[PDB]
Amino acid sequence: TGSLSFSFPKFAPNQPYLINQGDALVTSTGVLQLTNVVNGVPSSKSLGRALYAAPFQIWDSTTGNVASFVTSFTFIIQAPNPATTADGLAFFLAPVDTQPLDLGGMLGIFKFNKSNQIVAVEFDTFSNGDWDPKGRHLGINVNSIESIKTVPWNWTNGEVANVFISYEASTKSLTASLVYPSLETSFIIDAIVDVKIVLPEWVRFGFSATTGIDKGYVQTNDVLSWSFESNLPG
Amino acid sequence: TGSLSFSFPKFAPNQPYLINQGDALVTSTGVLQLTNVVNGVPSSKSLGRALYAAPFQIWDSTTGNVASFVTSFTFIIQAPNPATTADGLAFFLAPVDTQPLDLGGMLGIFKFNKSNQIVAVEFDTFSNGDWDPKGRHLGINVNSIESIKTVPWNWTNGEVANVFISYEASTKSLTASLVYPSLETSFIIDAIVDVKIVLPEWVRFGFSATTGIDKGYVQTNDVLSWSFESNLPG
Amino acid sequence: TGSLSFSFPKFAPNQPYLINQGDALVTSTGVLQLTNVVNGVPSSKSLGRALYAAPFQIWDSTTGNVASFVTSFTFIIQAPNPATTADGLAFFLAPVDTQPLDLGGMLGIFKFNKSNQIVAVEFDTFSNGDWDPKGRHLGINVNSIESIKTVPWNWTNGEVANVFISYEASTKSLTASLVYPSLETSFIIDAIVDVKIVLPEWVRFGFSATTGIDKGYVQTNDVLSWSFESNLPG
Amino acid sequence: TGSLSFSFPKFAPNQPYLINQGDALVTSTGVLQLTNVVNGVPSSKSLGRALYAAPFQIWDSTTGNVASFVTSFTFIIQAPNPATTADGLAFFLAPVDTQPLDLGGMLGIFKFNKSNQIVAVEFDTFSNGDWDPKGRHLGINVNSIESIKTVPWNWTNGEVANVFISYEASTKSLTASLVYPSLETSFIIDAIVDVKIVLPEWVRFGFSATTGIDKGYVQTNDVLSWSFESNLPG
Numbered sequence A, B, C, D: 001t002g003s004l005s006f007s008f009p010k011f012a013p014n015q016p017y018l019i020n021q022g023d024a025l026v027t028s029t030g031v032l033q034l035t036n037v038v039n040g041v042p043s044s045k046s047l048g049r050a051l052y053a054a055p056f057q058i059w060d061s062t063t064g065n066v067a068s069f070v071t072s073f074t075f076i077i078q079a080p081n082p083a084t085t086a087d088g089l090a091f092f093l094a095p096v097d098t099q100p101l102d103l104g105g106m107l108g109i110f111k112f113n114k115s116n117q118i119v120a121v122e123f124d125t126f127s128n129g130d131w132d133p134k135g136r137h138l139g140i141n142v143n144s145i146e147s148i149k150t151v152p153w154n155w156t157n158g159e160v161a162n163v164f165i166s167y168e169a170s171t172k173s174l175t176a177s178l179v180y181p182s183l184e185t186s187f188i189i190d191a192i193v194d195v196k197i198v199l200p201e202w203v204r205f206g207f208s209a210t211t212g213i214d215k216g217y218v219q220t221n222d223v224l225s226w227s228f229e230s231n232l233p234g
């Protein structure tokens, strides 16, 4: 039993409230730069992740209760050539000792190991023919790169996106939405996810992003703010 | 400056935390029944509203600050004949002394009086040819029955819907989403709404719903739970 | 089951978030003036109360659960003659339809009617020989003017006091503390209070204060800010 | 700018939400055992600390704002010989890289290094003649083992104590209180502490405790639960 909440209107560099993995770094301007950028231009074969320093308990094996949580964040994906973008950004939950995985289409969160249990909401900017639908899309993933559900997403180059994710334990319902406040455009996806049968009791959480493996298929993956709140009933 | 938050997993009847208007009532089972139902069958020409007992400050004239808030609720709209439904349910904000207005298509929140300023998210089950798009839809309204923006909505007879509404003062962005957790279907709408130039400093808020004026065009409008949270920066 | 929280750094006049009773009023400066003041001088035989507009559920008869809550507020008690002060200020919980009771020593919250169940923390500025200890004191009262426990209080004329009250359902422990931030002085009291066996499921709450009945025994009773938070486990 | 809150009704062992230092450990029963215990009997020369995994921002150098926070926890101090107890338990704030310091009377948080800035509330069970008052006492410390203020404390062997600490930035007021819910006894202390001029922008926080250096002067220092909440205005 327990709870956890926080709010970061921007990110302060060199402060242990985040666990940086791969190429992820925090700029002097307070931006969480998940993937490498060289003189404004994003580089290929990049992978970066950022987890909150502390994990939270998503379910209790003694009481059998499951936590409900919500998280919101703003991010920007900018690309020199809007026709060739890759690979995407994601919010995910995984074991406390989670480490970055495969590059590119794997979004750094997938590589079946029963110890690599993961739930994620993906903002996929490149469709992989072997497991992805057509065009860019939002997706909800459980233990593999192939989403259990997807919906079309009209990505807007360099535009600020506001994301909201919520999980209602009582109905095992995970909802994810993305809005471009400046454009008044919005997208949403929902799926049943039984976290109790997927993830361990305690999990770390945060962001993961990668750029394309092939030249030209690059993009930035910057998070600008982040708030979180969970509650595990006693 | 200030804040307000609450959570009602269900509604308790005969308790002054809600201000009931029109035909609205709370059943012994804890359901907020906005419109009249006779032996299971909803009646026509019904109008009911429910406001939280206390208002909250949505903006401060001294500091110029604007509040950000979120609210979520679950509701059910059941109809004997799914082909003829009317009129809809809405979440709205208005002056503290707000009273029910016109029936039917007006959703009990519209009737231009500068004192009847109102912002609302509507779940419209009947398209009025004079100001509504085709088919059922979600809508964001500011001072009139004609929404500033709408999106198609596939209403599911008697299914439990989860709604989430959020307002980010910094971007004047109002987002509204509806999900049917059991069906994994979802809808969303977003629009710019400058509450500071629309509503007074303090406002009351809650639900309003009406049934059709013509025989046959009836439906229930039941809210099952409600949580709210606002914050006006100092 | 449910929750309620709010924060008022100051009070806005003419806004229905408070239910004013007796002589209570909100000044243009945002001060909650519980008892009458004439040209700076407090008058005798005054009684004023202020309740939050909405009640909250303090315990659930179906689940048997009891809520835990905390509240904090700042207040000032100023008197022309610091040697003759009366009668006091209190924070209390009572049935939703609670109305002001007796003046003076009764603090407007006591008058045995099983329907007038009340729990209160009193900041008593005058010792009534028939039921009060010696000198000014903090007190915890349950159903009567005679406190179940008291502790000495060194009241400081016109000084700003910060009060904190907390109730832990699991241990039925009610704690009340008063601090004069400017003077670094502090006082505290604690007592077991079984709210489940004392109060009804839903209760309204707030402040009550009275001035002395005899000439000269007067004082102001002004609250400057107020925050509250309760949680009833499901 | 930002915020952080959490609640742990008990502690789960082997989970990275806490940073354990010195002899501190979490028992299978969920108790945070700060100092060594051998077969029920606490050992001497022990020192243990526990910090939340993530730090929080206590003040912003760009806006100049200072955070307000509150924390509560329950703890037990049990001793074989209630006549000889040492040394104490404390809640403290310090730089993110804080490491345990001196044993015994230094409570593991003191050793003047401008980089070892620290603010702490101490529950001192042994009076050190060179800097402590008479008998056990609560204390508020800023940069040294000599408290800026103390108050007598009647420690009760093995009894469960509830502690509440609050800091109001606007008045730079730090309040600390201890209550024995079962006994209805209570103690409190308050002092002005300008965290902005004492601590760095970001700080880690938690508990520290030590046992006596001389044989016989031992005691357990167990924390049973912990909740925290801070808010740094934008």
Ligand SMILES: CC(=O)N[C@@H]1[C@@H](O)[C@@H](O)[C@@H](CO)O[C@@H]1O
Binding pocket: A086, A087, A103, A104, A105, A106, A126, A128, A211, A212, A213, A214, A217
């Ligand atoms: C499996 C894998 O990483 N596939 C990647 C794909 O995700 C994308 O990065 C592409 C660039 O054109 O290069 C590869 O095909």
Ligand SMILES: CC(=O)N[C@@H]1[C@@H](O)[C@@H](O)[C@@H](CO)O[C@@H]1O
Binding pocket: B086, B087, B103, B104, B105, B106, B126, B128, B211, B212, B213, B214, B217
């Ligand atoms: C303006 C107005 O209330 N119009 C209503 C419409 O909203 C709907 O209730 C309909 C039923 O068939 O009856 C009328 O046309």
Ligand SMILES: CC(=O)N[C@@H]1[C@@H](O)[C@@H](O)[C@@H](CO)O[C@@H]1O
Binding pocket: C086, C087, C103, C104, C105, C106, C126, C128, C211, C212, C213, C214, C217
């Ligand atoms: C019962 C009662 O109200 N007693 C009051 C007491 O509370 C105080 O106001 C006093 C003034 O000197 O006058 C009376 O004795």
Ligand SMILES: CC(=O)N[C@@H]1[C@@H](O)[C@@H](O)[C@@H](CO)O[C@@H]1O
Binding pocket: D086, D087, D103, D104, D105, D106, D126, D128, D211, D212, D213, D214, D217
């Ligand atoms: C400076 C220091 O650690 N002094 C300690 C004191 O704190 C206490 O532990 C005592 C036991 O009798 O032994 C020493 O005097």
Ligand SMILES: [Ca+2]
Binding pocket: A087, A088, A105, A124, A125, A126, A127, A128, A132
């Ligand atoms: Ca892909």
Ligand SMILES: [Ca+2]
Binding pocket: B087, B088, B105, B124, B125, B126, B127, B128, B132
């Ligand atoms: Ca319509």
Ligand SMILES: [Ca+2]
Binding pocket: C087, C088, C105, C124, C125, C126, C127, C128, C132
């Ligand atoms: Ca008295």
Ligand SMILES: [Ca+2]
Binding pocket: D087, D088, D105, D124, D125, D126, D127, D128, D132
């Ligand atoms: Ca000492």
